[PDB]
Amino acid sequence: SGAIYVGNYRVVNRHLATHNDWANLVWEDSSRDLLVSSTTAQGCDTIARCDCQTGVYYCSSRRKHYPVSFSKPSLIFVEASEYYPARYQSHLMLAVGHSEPGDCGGILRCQHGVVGIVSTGGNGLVGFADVRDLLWLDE
Numbered sequence: 001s002g003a004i005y006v007g008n009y010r011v012v013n014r015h016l017a018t019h020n021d022w023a024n025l026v027w028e029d030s031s032r033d034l035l036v037s038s039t040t041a042q043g044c045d046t047i048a049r050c051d052c053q054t055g056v057y058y059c060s061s062r063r064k065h066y067p068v069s070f071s072k073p074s075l076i077f078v079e080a081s082e083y084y085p086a087r088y089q090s091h092l093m094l095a096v097g098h099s100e101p102g103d104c105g106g107i108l109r110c111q112h113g114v115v116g117i118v119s120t121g122g123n124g125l126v127g128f129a130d131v132r133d134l135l136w137l138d139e
C-alpha cells in the first residue's frame with residue numbers, strides 16, 4: 001500500500017484504489033496501473049521532472065529503503081491477477097531489488113523528488129510506474 005499526495009491530488013496504484021478514490025476520480029489508466037483522485041487537504045510531496053536512472057525506494061516487506069539503478073519508462077509484459085489479464089504495462093521502469101506482493105505503493109525518489117511508485121516485481125526485480133510525465137499534477 002501507499003500513495004503520492006501533491007496539491008489537491010492523491011496518486012495510487014489503480015488495482016488498490018478505494019470507493020472514495022473512484023467517487024472523486026480525476027484520471028485513471030489501466031495500462032499504467034495508475035489512478036488519481038481529488039483531496040480537500042493540500043499535498044505533502046514534490047514531483048521530479050528529470051531523466052534520472054538512480055534513486056531510492058521504500059520496501060514495506062523489509063521495512064527498509066534501498067538504493068537502485070532503474071531503466072527508462074517503457075512497455076513491459078505482465079501476468080494475470082485478480083485485477084488484470086496478461087498485457088503490456090506502459091511507462092514502467094525495472095530495477096534489481098527485492099519486492100513481494102504487498103510492496104505496491106512504495107515511493108521511488110531521486111535528488112529531484114518523487115519519481116514513481118512500486119507496481120510490479122518478481123525474481124530479484126522490482127517495477128515502478130513512472131509519474132514524471134504527468135505535468136498537470138503540478139498545476
Ligand SMILES: CSc1ccccc1CC(=O)N1C[C@H](C)C[C@H](C(N)=O)C1
Nearest residue numbers: 033081099100101103104119120121122
Ligand atoms: C511488487 S508486485 C510483485 C512483486 C513480486 C512478485 C509479484 C508481484 C505481483 C505483481 O507484479 N503484480 C500483481 C499485482 C496485483 C498487479 C501488478 C500489475 N501492475 O499488473 C502485477
Ligand SMILES: [Zn+2]
Nearest residue numbers: 050052110112
Ligand atoms: Zn531526478
